[PDB]
């Protein structure tokens, strides 16, 4: 699709905000990454840029990229963005501030394209794993092993399953906003917005203050270029401060929700589950860390816990009423006993 | 007659019980205490789930008398920082020399995973108590029916009139207050919802996945954004979710006594392998097989001609019975101490006739109370291997 | 340290106590209790109230057996009757010639009085209970503090933490099961939930006052239609919240333990006047008056300047005060047998300063706890009397 | 009132029904009494006629009288009506299907307008009780005492605050509807309805209906003259069945809710409060039965129960935290303990 929820698209407009670490003396780049979410366990990561790529703010094409340079957009191709995490990602779809991308897992996320007088890249921390939700935990994107139940992302961008605060935005600097009132620096709107203000010099800065500007300060770089977008409510980033005198309502959804089904997944290479006489001999040979653990079945209790991330023949003494064997977030298996070494006389010879 | 039967409340075991009687013929049952049911009244106190620092946008008052105010979705962690003269594309937006402060605010807010597949606390009230009990019969073939144990229906459901419980799993093996996160159950106590405890379970405490009121501190500590430019550092400890599958506490679907594994539950521990449901049935005499329409078994002998044995289902032993009467014959090793493949097998007088059963033995010397009169039904047979397989089909264990 | 008060709980009366503090100067109390509340972690089982036989409309299938359709109100009396020959204008509305059936159905349904002036059951547990005692110190200030069991909810209400024992309201005067009728609250059983039948107050169990579902047996009896012709005979007998108002339990707004009254409440005990409230507070220096005022009150003697024979405030007595350092000195009798209206009485070295009080007899030899020094204000007076007037301002009373 | 409440009126018709104490063999009473409500705490009693008096079905006046004669209304003056309960009533107001009328409580209700050779009445049983709230419990006040806060009904017609399940002007026979399909009985709609039907002859006998007609059996009396009305709502009556074909379960209000006002209530004078030393001497002399009870305070509960209906001096031992004394269902009095009678030491509970 291109159009999935004009909830986000129409009612949001890009903005440019500071990147938390960029190492160009800490560049400002419109790819300022907040909310990395490798919270789908299926190879896929949702990333948030501070700019609203997707549809420009209109009806046409996920294949554009509209960030702010100035107070103005810069409506160019989607593919001029480069999300990456470890190895280069492959886009799945963009919607709003949010992109879904097939990426390697990563402790960080590292996005970047040339913009400004620099190379304008952006990086941020967020712990990602494509862990099974259970007694296993995994790294790399699926390419092996059995499927078993964990999170996975929606390819659907209409989701009202959660919503992120976007109600009354505020500033980011865009001193392209800030014109001059013929000696003193003058607040202006990006494309509409109730834009609040102050300078180092005295000015009113509580209430709506789009009709107030500072009449005592000349320097542009000591004043509050604002975007309270109250008709195109933008993502509320940490690198986008809020107003304090205004209130608008415009809480706006997130397109991509990690949902649980049969995620494309992993299963740590096949364990040998064999029952001998009241004993599960278990040759084990995993890849990703598997918590093997048990539930000795019957009147019995006897659990065992040991993370197995190393090949080990272990044993679990199966009782008459059974033992259970829980090779990670692979579903619990079960074993009864009375033996399984074969041959307890308890009959009458005649054969 | 009125066939009491208690067995471990073990999900996957057909214990194939026997009504011992001499008025009418003994008749088989299967008192199979299938699936551990527990289910009391509960209260959702708060969802927990790994954070997402979904910043509400920092309320910034840069100079003079600071305010971080209040906007919808209360509870905001907010900390002034100085040594900044910010940038975000253009110049500084905090800039006075009376302060020079840029006030960053970040709260913990529910992740998208909070909505779906999430840790979920409960303060669980004493409430109701439930059981699930199969009763088969040496006439009737199966019914595995949910049965209450509290004030609502601890009487008849399916065949016979059956009085159920109290269970030994009337409460879960886990604590009164219980967290559940997927399959994995984490027992954690807290008194009731309010403002929780950070860096432990209930460090996020949102009443539900999308909410206004919450407790927003997963050990969320804002720090100074160095280099005179502003972003918002989130220093955060793992939540009760991240802990609970890879920084896990106690995974109760693998460490809850009995034999339990669990799903998403209010406070129920599915699949427990004890939790014993003491079943007692008031069986009308009509439902039986008559003792004269069964052999009143006499001249009991068990032998084989050829045999192969199976401890799941398929264990056989021919029987040389030359009984006083003849008829149909429900069989079972008295009171769920065998698994019988059959409900009822006919047995007459004169000759030899195999029946099927299964027991916790490798050759068939399990007593069998064949519609009156027990006998250990030996026969050479052949050892099976069939014990790699799940919850018993060899009763509560009592033979080889 | 702490806020002494050993002087009873009443209500109406402005009764007092004196905080023994030695680190700082003592502080007078006016302990005005008139609000008291319990409020545990509880569960509303059902609103109750008497029936209203709002005769439902049955799905009459007519003759050849009639089947009673399940209506959206659980539990219903429905009885087929034959031998009718319906009329409702013209002729039969059933399909037999005159062998017609009329299936009368009547269930109990929420009364319009259930909405307002009703009854309300509760299973009353403990989880959040509060012992509320306002003290308007008067010397210092107000605090209306509470106690809380759950620890995700503050108990630092008031100035700080205030501990009562015997508690002023953290118990329930009513039982675990309570039925309510307006003013009169009856600490009386009711049958659990979802099971209630006639012969108790709680025979009607609507989950809300005006509901859609309920449990409807209040001894509603359908009987055979009259004259061998259609209609619904509903015979309705007394129920909860009709009887048990003269079959009544203990009417707690006049008989509550702990000297309280009760009404329709989320579990509260209004207007308590428990045996005593020994109040003890863990409070900073702010709740006290400072030591600079007088480190210890060194010498003093008190004698009347004409007193009262009554616990009306009008008794006066000069006191030739003296102190280690001159300043203020909160006062009150350390038994509260004289209840003192002076928040603070000034002390200068070897001066004399009258205070105000209320006593109860012509020779008021009541100690006055002059912020670390007691003194008897003996002397003959004139006797005014008036002793029908509200709960003791002489509390701990059992004298003339 | 006469303004908005066309919820009931327009979307209803009075429904002709039946009553046992009538006719020569039971008259069809369109004023068939169900749901008597003297169940309140009041003095005014609510009756439900099957008839929708009030507005005719029109806009104005609660003093007309529309009962059903035929399938048609009979919209006439209310001056032929006689509400009574177990004493002659004076109507207060009708609203919906429900009439409020000022009369004493009564075990039965007896309504009737003259029409025909017979006096055409209708009567029904229902256990009724008023009471003044609190200690003094009666079936309705005697004629004495103070008014104090209990349930009572309003003068005015609109008096919402409850809702009863409404199905429709349900199934009743109206054989004025029932034409003939050339020899077989043919049901017609009252006002637009899916009209429920069956005969001994085939159709649907569950009352699953989308305009059932059975025109297969000749007799009018061997068929089910039933009416599931599909855009109308009236009070659920037992003498007005419902089906399940297109029945509503839609709760639609009841007017004449007994609401919190000052009910006529009780209290008998002469408490005669007197206190000598820790004791309330009380000369008592009531007009009518007074439930007295007290609480000698403390952790002490000290109940008292005594009906006082004639002169008795009682006593209640006041204590160190007082006693209260509750002469009837009027609120608690209060008393400090201590000697009246001059001259003693003071300053402790010891002197």
UniProtKB/Swiss-Prot annotation, chains A, D:
Palmitoylated via thioester bonds. These palmitoylations may induce disruption of the C-terminus transmembrane. This would result in the reorientation of E2 C-terminus from lumenal to cytoplasmic side. N-glycosylated. It is a single-pass type I membrane protein. It is found in: Virion membrane; Host cell membrane. Residues 1-351 are extracellular. Processing of the precursor of protein E3/E2 into E2 and E3 results in a heterodimer of the spike glycoproteins E2 and E1. Spike at virion surface are constituted of three E2-E1 heterodimers. Interacts with 6K protein. Plays a role in viral attachment to target host cell, by binding to the cell receptor. Synthesized as a p62 precursor which is processed by furin at the cell membrane just before virion budding, giving rise to E2-E1 heterodimer. The p62-E1 heterodimer is stable, whereas E2-E1 is unstable and dissociate at low pH. p62 is processed at the last step, presumably to avoid E1 fusion activation before its final export to cell surface. This is Spike glycoprotein E2. It comes from Eastern equine encephalitis virus (strain Florida 91-469) (EEEV).
């Amino acid at each position: 699709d291109l159009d999935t929820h004009f909830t986000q698209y129409k009612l949001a407009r890009p903005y440019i905000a500071d990147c938390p670490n960029c190492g160009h003396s800490r560049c400002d780049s419109p790819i300022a990454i907040e909310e990395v979410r490798g919270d789908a366990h299926a190879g896929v990561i949702r990333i948030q840029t501070s700019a609203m790529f997707g549809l420009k703010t209109d009806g046409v094409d996920l294949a554009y990229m509209s960030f702010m340079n100035g107070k103005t957009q810069k409506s160019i191709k989607i593919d001029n963005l480069h999300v990456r995490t470890s190895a280069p990602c492959s886009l799945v779809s963009h919607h709003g501030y949010y992109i879904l991308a097939q990426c390697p897992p990563g402790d960080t996320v590292t996005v970047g394209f040339h913009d400004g007088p620099n190379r304008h890249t952006c990086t941020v921390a967020h712990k990602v794993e494509f862990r099974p939700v259970g007694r296993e935990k995994y790294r790399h994107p699926p390419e092996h092993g059995v499927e078993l139940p964990c999170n996975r992302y929606t390819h659907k961008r209409a989701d009202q399953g959660h919503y992120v605060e976007m109600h009354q935005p505020g500033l980011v600097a865009d001193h392209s906003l800030l014109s001059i009132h013929s000696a003193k620096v003058k607040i202006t709107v990006p494309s509409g917005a109730q834009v609040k203000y102050y300078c180092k010099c005295p000015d009113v800065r509580e209430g709506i203050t789009s009709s107030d500007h500072t009449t005592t300060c000349t320097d542009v770089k000591q004043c509050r270029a604002y975007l309270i977008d109250n008709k195109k409510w933008v993502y509320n980033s940490g690198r986008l401060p809020r107003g304090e005198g205004d209130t608008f309502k415009g809480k706006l959804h997130v397109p991509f929700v990690p949902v649980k089904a049969k995620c494309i997944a992993t299963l740590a290479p096949e364990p040998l589950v064999e029952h001998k006489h009241r004993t599960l001999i278990l040759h084990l040979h995993p890849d990703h860390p598997t918590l093997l653990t048990t539930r000795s079945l019957g009147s019995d209790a006897n659990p065992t816990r040991q993370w197995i991330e190393r090949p080990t023949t272990v044993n679990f003494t199966v009782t008459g009423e059974g033992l259970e064997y829980t090779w990670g977030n692979h579903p619990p298996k079960r074993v009864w006993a009375q033996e399984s070494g074969e041959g307890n006389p308890h009959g009458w010879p005649h054969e | 007659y009125e066939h009491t039967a208690v067995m471990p409340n073990k999900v996957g075991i057909p214990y194939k019980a026997l009504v011992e009687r001499p008025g009418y013929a003994p008749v088989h049952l299967q008192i199979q205490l299938v699936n551990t049911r527990i289910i009391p009244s509960t209260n959702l106190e708060y969802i927990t789930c790994k954070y997402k620092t979904k910043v509400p946008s920092p309320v910034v008052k840069c100079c003079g008398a600071t305010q971080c105010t209040s906007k919808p979705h209360p509870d905001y962690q907010c900390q002034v920082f100085t040594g900044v003269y910010p940038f975000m594309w253009g110049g500084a937006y905090c800039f006075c020399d009376t302060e020079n402060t840029q006030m960053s605010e970040a709260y913990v807010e529910r992740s998208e995973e909070c909505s779906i597949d999430h840790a979920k606390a409960y303060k669980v009230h004493t409430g109701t108590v439930q059981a699930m009990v199969n009763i088969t019969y040496g006439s009737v073939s199966w019914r595995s029916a949910d049965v209450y144990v509290n004030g609502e229906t601890p009487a008849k459901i399916g065949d016979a009139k059956l009085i159920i419980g109290p269970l030994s799993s009337a409460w879960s093996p886990f604590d009164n207050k219980v967290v559940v996160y997927g399959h994995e159950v984490y027992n954690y106590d807290f008194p009731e919802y309010g403002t929780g405890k950070a860096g432990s379970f209930g460090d996020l405490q949102s009443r539900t996945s999308t909410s206004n009121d919450l407790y927003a501190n997963t050990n969320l500590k804002l720090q100074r954004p160095q280099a005179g430019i502003v972003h918002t550092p989130f220093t955060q400890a793992p939540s009760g979710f991240e802990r609970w599958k890879r920084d896990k506490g106690a995974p109760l679907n693998d460490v809850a006594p009995f034999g339990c594994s669990i799903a998403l539950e209010p406070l129920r521990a599915e699949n427990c392998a004890v939790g014993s449901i003491p079943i007692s049935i008031d069986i009308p005499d009509a439902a039986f097989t008559r003792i004269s329409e069964t052999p009143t078994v006499s001249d009991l002998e068990c032998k084989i001609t050829e045999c192969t044995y199976a401890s799941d289902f398929g264990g056989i032993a021919t029987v040389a019975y030359k009984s006083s009467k003849a008829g149909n014959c429900p069989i079972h090793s008295p009171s769920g101490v065998a698994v019988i493949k059959e409900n009822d097998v006919t047995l007459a007088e004169s000759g030899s006739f195999t029946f099927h059963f299964s027991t916790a033995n490798i050759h068939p010397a399990f007593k069998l109370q064949v519609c009156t009169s027990a006998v250990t039904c030996k026969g050479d047979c052949k050892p099976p291997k069939d014990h790699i397989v799940d919850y018993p089909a060899q009763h509560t264990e009592s033979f080889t």
